[PDB]
Design a protein around this ligand. Sequence first.
Ligand SMILES: CCCCCCCCCCCCC/C=C/[C@@H](O)[C@H](CO[C@@H]1O[C@H](CO)[C@H](O)[C@H](OS(=O)(=O)O)[C@H]1O)NC(=O)[C@H](O)CCCCCCCCCCCCCCCCCCCCCC
Ligand SMILES: CCCCCCCCCCOCCOCCOCCOCCOCCOCCO
Ligand SMILES: CCCCCCCCCCOCCOCCOCCOCCOCCOCCO
Length: 60
Amino acid sequence: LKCNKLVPLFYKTCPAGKNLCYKMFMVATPKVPVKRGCIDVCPKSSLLVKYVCCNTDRCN
Ligand SMILES: CCCCCCCCCCCCC/C=C/[C@@H](O)[C@H](CO[C@@H]1O[C@H](CO)[C@H](O)[C@H](OS(=O)(=O)O)[C@H]1O)NC(=O)[C@H](O)CCCCCCCCCCCCCCCCCCCCCC
Ligand SMILES: CCCCCCCCCCOCCOCCOCCOCCOCCOCCO
Ligand SMILES: CCCCCCCCCCOCCOCCOCCOCCOCCOCCO
């Protein structure tokens, strides 16, 4: 699996066990992702922080 990094023109290959890509962002500014990469479990979205997870190449 491949996922994009903070600057989406750059990407990486996930290590074993991380079969999800993710994009994190502050709920009030959803067009500015503050973090991106590979993860194993999709983090729990809270009141102020939202996470979008997906499982296909450079989907985040
Ligand atoms: C011998 C040397 C030469 C080797 C061959 C050449 C290639 C070497 C490649 C080396 C690098 C591969 C590993 C890199 C993994 C990282 O890219 C990615 C980055 O993913 C995300 O990137 C985002 C930014 O774009 C954020 O930083 C995320 O941060 S966070 O908040 O989610 O934590 C971060 O999760 N992951 C990490 O760095 C994490 O620390 C990975 C921790 C979990 C993987 C290691 C433990 C796996 C479980 C092993 C259990 C026992 C069986 C192991 C079987 C596999 C054996 C073979 C080795 C596998 C090694 C995997 C690294
Ligand atoms: C662009 C495709 C990459 C495919 C390989 C995925 C693993 C990449 C490992 C890191 O890149 C290795 C080659 O670069 C040599 C230096 O390695 C250190 C990299 O440090 C991380 C900073 O570079 C990325 C900058 O972008 C920041 C996030 O947008
Ligand atoms: C700086 C002023 C502090 C005032 C404190 C006293 C008044 C507090 C009133 C509001 O209390 C609300 C409940 O707070 C509970 C603890 O906060 C947790 C917030 O989590 C937000 C995201 O959770 C969303 C639901 O998650 C469900 C499981 O995924």
